[PDB]
Amino acid sequence: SNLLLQYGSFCTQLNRALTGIAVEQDKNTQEVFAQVKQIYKTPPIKDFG
Amino acid sequence: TESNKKFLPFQQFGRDIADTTDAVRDPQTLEILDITPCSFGGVSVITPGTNTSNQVAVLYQDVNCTEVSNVFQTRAGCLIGAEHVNNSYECDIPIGAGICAVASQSIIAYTMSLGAENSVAYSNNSIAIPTNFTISVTTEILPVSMTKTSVDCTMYICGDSTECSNLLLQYGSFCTQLNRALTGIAVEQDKNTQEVFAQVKQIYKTPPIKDFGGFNFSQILPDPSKPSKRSPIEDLLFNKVTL
Amino acid sequence: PFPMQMAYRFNGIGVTQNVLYENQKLIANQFNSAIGKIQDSLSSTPSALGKLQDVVNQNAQALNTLVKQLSSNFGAISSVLNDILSRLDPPEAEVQIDRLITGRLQSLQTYVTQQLIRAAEIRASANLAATKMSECVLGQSKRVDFCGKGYHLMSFPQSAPHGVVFLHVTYVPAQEKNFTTAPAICHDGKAHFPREGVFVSNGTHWFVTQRNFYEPQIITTDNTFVSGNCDVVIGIVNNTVYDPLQPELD
Amino acid sequence: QKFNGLTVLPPLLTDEMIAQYTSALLAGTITSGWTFGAGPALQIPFPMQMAYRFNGIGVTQNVLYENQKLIANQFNSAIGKIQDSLSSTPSALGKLQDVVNQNAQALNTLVKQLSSNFGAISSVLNDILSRLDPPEAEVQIDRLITGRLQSLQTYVTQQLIRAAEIRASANLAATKMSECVLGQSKRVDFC
Ligand SMILES: *[C@@H]1O[C@H](CO)[C@@H](O[C@@H]2O[C@H](CO)[C@@H](O)[C@H](O)[C@H]2NC(C)=O)[C@H](O)[C@H]1NC(C)=O
Ligand SMILES: *[C@@H]1O[C@H](CO)[C@@H](O)[C@H](O)[C@H]1NC(C)=O
Ligand SMILES: *[C@@H]1O[C@H](CO)[C@@H](O)[C@H](O)[C@H]1NC(C)=O
Ligand SMILES: *[C@@H]1O[C@H](CO)[C@@H](O)[C@H](O)[C@H]1NC(C)=O
Ligand SMILES: *[C@@H]1O[C@H](CO)[C@@H](O)[C@H](O)[C@H]1NC(C)=O
Ligand SMILES: *[C@@H]1O[C@H](CO)[C@@H](O)[C@H](O)[C@H]1NC(C)=O
């Protein structure tokens, strides 16, 4: 590890890119699915004509 | 730990997919022990912010709550410092696996609510119709270009020294692929800005009298009395982003 | 004339022109107040400009780390190559330089690749901004949630450092009511269907109204049309249809 | 799975909450048509909604009312057939299985790189440390750091590209979510 410390900041660039991807995946799921301001519920009687 | 894998009489140690040690057979008995790497993981800090409070909670992402003041186990790890409350709220600080996290002068963790419950009074002879109407204006912000940076490969790597320049010249064309790529990005930023904005071949101009039937556009139209002829909103945007 | 422009923009989303002209003053007040609120919204809610701040911060950080990679030994006896060239013999300065050429070229490669990927992201965001500029300010979009939540009327573009801000003016149904309905009207054997809008009742009388704004109208032969008979349509109510010709001949 | 230094964080929205969101969107589409996207949920009988959707494609609404039972039977038959269609034709879920396969293969091929000497004397750093004196182990450990770091860099680069592709697919999915489920699209073969 003390020898690795002589390669600068590669080991935080990788762990900031991976975190960027990690948060981008939750942004993707939220942007696709969370488009309703309320959670609507269907009526108990399925008389839809 | 104990294992239920029946090793054959001739193998001593077992391997898992992608070349790792999974289990080993105790030489002094017939027992077969599985070897699991002991719990480890990154450590995450939940903070409301030094602007508000210096209270902090800390989450160990992949350990139980048996490895070092409330302590709550979640599917995302063991979170210490936050009290789990049963009632759901809007998600604030993301934790993971459905729990988000400040209220009542302490850090709380809860299962996120997805929104208010609202059933629709469905019937095959009832229609709702609006009897009035609101006009809303929303703001949508999109990036179009970024700073056209350029880095001189040879002078960056090999600062003003011919001795290193000879080795860099022995590394071939790298110091030309990098300049070519950065030049391509620089020109593509101008193409982006042109395609976003240069959509009118001629420059139209507003009339001097703002008799728009009661609509007031003074907040989006350029103000000639300003040195840079920008709208008040555009002023707020240029004064709101800091470098 | 701009009020007629907005009246046609109402027509384009299924609200007849007469809603605007009778309510032009209220529409003006709501538009002006919303534009006024935009200032407070942008100036008081942080992270509102986050999408624009993030790119400049990412580029500044990439440059900062790129420069900080110059302060790294990479296996060399020192970071400053001037000291190796001034202190070591070339037969060994060659080897000491190689272990800085490699690390600084690798840092440059990392930076260039990250910039290519982020440039592709900005390329996609710029193309989306161009598409919204074409289809929201330059015209009117019927595609929902593309020019903001609600029924789109218009958009106004604004410049921003390294970006664009759209003010989307949209129509949202507000106070609402619960009315009885029917898919057709049975009159002397003929089935009447609305040309535009639906039939509504408050219990006692049947009217026709546009679906996106309550405006009751008497049922006549010029807003309804006849097809088939009363025994085919499931769920019909019985009301009478008035023909303006009857009072003109009587 | 869990190896040396590799973790998988759980998604913030669990499958239960995703299912609850799609249930909310389905209840909206069923009980209020497209109006729950624009503003408040406005109650409309489902046949009148489908009559609107016929009106929007140039077929007069009466065609629905006169053929309501046939329309219902065809819609129920198609919805029933969708299960057999996707459950009986293989590769139907290839677009979702391929993402998982590529991520798992990238992780396995990141781990496999640890068992490569990279030009040194033994792929285990502890073995070179235990057999060579530090002044000489330094070079072999430099090899086992440079190669492994280059492998991690390649993995992260390919994950950035794949994340960009999946983000493009997610953006198209959100566009379809708005312009196909929340409303009705005049864009041909887009929905
Ligand atoms: C329709 O709504 C508007 C506003 O939602 C009403 O207009 C006035 O608006 C201001 C704020 O914009 C309120 O303080 C007033 O209470 C509103 N009413 C009046 C009389 O000023 C408008 O009145 C509404 N129309 C109907 C028929 O309800
Ligand atoms: C009135 O509104 C309620 C809920 O808003 C709804 O359940 C009901 O069906 C509507 N009509 C009547 C006649 O009550
Ligand atoms: C739905 O329609 C049927 C016949 O068309 C009717 O009997 C039933 O009462 C209707 N539903 C409600 C809730 O009134
Ligand atoms: C329009 O809004 C501006 C905002 O500053 C206000 O000063 C002005 O009086 C308003 N009316 C007109 C006619 O400009
Ligand atoms: C409506 O009128 C028709 C004749 O015009 C009659 O046969 C029917 O019973 C009436 N009531 C209904 C359809 O509910
Ligand atoms: C229902 O509509 C009729 C027709 O305009 C009106 O006279 C009546 O006052 C309304 N309200 C009722 C019946 O409660």
- Count the neighbouring beta carbons within 10 Å of the beta carbon of residue D62: 21
Are C49 and C42 contacting, i.e. CB atoms less than 8 angstroms apart? yes
Ligand nearest to the CA of C177: 2
Which other chains touch chain C, taking contact as 3+ CB pairs less than 8 Å apart? A, B, D
What's the CA gap between B7 and C27, in Å, rounded?
A: 81
Q: What gap in Å lies between CA D74 and CA C211, rounded to an integer?
A: 28
Q: Shortest CA distance to D178 belongs to which of D57, D187, D50, D167?
A: D187
B156 touches chain C (CB under 8 A): yes
Residues B236, C160 contacting (CB under 8 angstroms): no
Provide the shortest C-alpha distance from residue C183 to chain A (in Å).
Answer: 12
Q: How far is CA D32 from the centre of its chain?
A: 28
Task: Give CA–CA dist C197/C183, Å, rounded.
Answer: 11
Largest interatomic CA distance in chain D: 91
Instruction: Tell me how far apart the alpha carbons of residues C39 and C14 are, in angstroms, rounded to a whole number.
Output: 31
Tell me if chain A has a CB within 8 Å of the CB of C103.
yes
- The Cβ of residue C107 has, within 10 Å, a number of other Cβ atoms equal to 25
Element (H, E) at D105: helix D94-112
- Residue carrying the six token digits 């320049």: B165
What gap in Å lies between CA B42 and CA B56, rounded to an integer? 17
Among protein residues, the one whose CA lies closest to atom 12 of ligand 6: C202
* Contact C214/B at CB under 8 A: yes
**Which residue, C30, C49, C194, is CA-closest to B237?**
C49
CA separation for the pair C155, A41 (Å, rounded): 34
> Torsions phi, psi of B119, nearest 5?
-80, 150
> Distance between CA C29 and CA D177 in Å, rounded?
33
Interface contact flag, C172 D62, Cβ < 8 Å: no
Is A42 near chain C, with CB under 8 Å? no
Side chain identity at C168, as an amino acid letter? H
SS3 string, B142-211, reads EECCCCCCCCCHHHHHCCCCHHHHHHHHHCCCHHHHHHHHHHHHHHHHHHHHHHHHCCCCCCCCCCCCCC
Give the span between the Cα atoms of B114 and D12, in whole angstroms.
12
Distance C202 CA to ligand 6 centre (A): 7
Q: What is the Cα B72 distance to its own chain's centre?
A: 25
Contact D140, D120 (CB under 8 A): yes
Looking at all shown ligands, the one closest to residue D47's CA atom is 3
Burial label for D115, CB within 10 Å (0-12, 13-18, 19+), is exposed
The structure tokens listed for B148 are 């056209």
Q: Concatenated DSSP letters for C108-155?
A: HHHHHHHHHHHHHHHHHHHHHHHHHIIIIISS---STTTSSSSEEEEE
Ligand 3 atom closest to B123 (CA): 13
* Residues C222/C224/C228/C233 CA torsion (nearest 10 deg): -170
Cβ–Cβ below 8 Å for D159 and A14: no
* H-run or E-run covering A23: helix A10-33
The residue behind tokens 């085919």 is C232
Contact B25, B13 (CB under 8 A): yes
Query: Which residue's C-alpha comes closest to atom 7 of ligand 2?
Result: B121
Q: Where are the alpha helices (DSSP H) in chain C?
A: 2-11, 18-22, 24-44, 50-68, 81-87, 90-132, 245-249
Does ligand 5 have an atom closer than 6 angstroms to the CB of C236?
Answer: yes
- Residue D48 at interface with chain B, using a CB cutoff of 8 Å: yes
Amino acid at C200: V
Separation between Cα atoms, residue C84 and residue C82, nearest integer Å: 6
Is B123 touching ligand 2 by the criterion CB < 6 Å? yes
C192: amino acid identity, one letter: H
Nearest ligand by distance to the CA of C187:
5
The helix or strand, by DSSP H or E, that contains position D155, with its residue range, turns out to be: helix D134-176
Q: Which of A39, A45, A46, A48 to mutate to test the interface with B (most CBs of B within 10 A)?
A: A39
Q: Is the CB of B121 under 6 A from ligand 2?
A: yes
Half-sphere exposure of D46 (CA within 13 A, CB side): 17
Q: Crossing angle for the helix pair D134-176 and A10-33, nearest 10 degrees?
A: 20
- In 3-state terms, what secondary structure has residue B92? coil
Give the position of tokens 């840092």: C107
C131-159 burial: b if 16+ Cβ within 10 Å, else e: ebbebbbeebbbbbbbbbbbbbbbbbbbb
| Cα(D170)–Cα(D162) distance, integer angstroms | 12
Contact B219 C38 (CB under 8 A): yes
In angstroms, the CA C63 to CA C65 distance is 5
Q: If DSSP codes are grouped into helix, strand and coil, which group holds residue D137?
A: helix
Q: From the CA of B124, how far away is ligand 3's center (Å)?
A: 6
Ligand 2 atom closest to residue C179's alpha carbon, by position in its atom list: 11
Distances (CA, A) of B214 to B210, C6, C24, C25, C155: 9, 12, 8, 7, 18
**Nearest residue (CA) to ligand 5, atom 9:** C238
Q: Does any CB of chain C come closer than 8 Å to the CB of residue A14?
A: no
Counting ligands in written order, which one lies closest to the CA of residue C188? 5
In contact, A38 and D31? CB cutoff 8 Å? no
Q: Which helix (H) or strand (E) is A21 found in, with range?
A: helix A10-33
Please indicate whether residue C229, judged by its CB atom, sits closer than 6 Å to ligand 5.
no
| Distance of residue D145 Cα from the nearest chain B Cα, in angstroms | 19
Q: Which of C137, C144, C133 is nearest to C13 (CA)?
A: C144
Q: Which chain C residues are closer than 8 Å to B187 by Cβ?
A: none
Distance CA C89, CA C93 (A): 6
Residue with tokens 């064309």: B173
Identify all chain B residues contacting C97, using CB atoms and an 8 Å cutoff.
158, 163-164, 167
D125 touching chain A per CB within 8 A? no
Q: How far apart are CA C244 and CA C239, in angstroms?
A: 16
The nearest CA of chain B is from the CA of A39 a distance in Å of 5
Closest CA to A22 of D11, B33, D36: D11
Distance B227 CA to ligand 4 centre (A): 20
10 Å CB burial of residue D85 (0-12, 13-18, 19+) is exposed
CA distance B186 to B163: 31
Closest ligand 4 atom number to CA of residue B216: 1
Q: Integer distance in angstroms from the first to the last C-alpha of chain D?
A: 38
Inter-chain touch D17–B112, beta carbons under 8 Å = yes
First to last CA, chain A: 70
Greatest Cα pair distance in chain C:
120
Report how far residue B98's alpha carbon sits from residue A19's, in angstroms, rounded to the nearest whole number: 18
Contacts (Cβ under 8 Å, ≥6 apart) of A48: D30, D46
Q: Give yes or no for a contact between B157 and B168, defined as CB atoms under 8 angstroms apart.
A: yes
How much distance in Å is there from the Cα of B89 to the middle of ligand 2? 30
> Looking at the complex, does the CB of residue C138 fall below 8 Å from at least one CB of chain D?
no
| C86 in reach of chain B (CB within 8 A) | no
CA gyration radius, chain B? 32
Rounded to whole angstroms, how far apart are CA atoms C71 and A8? 8
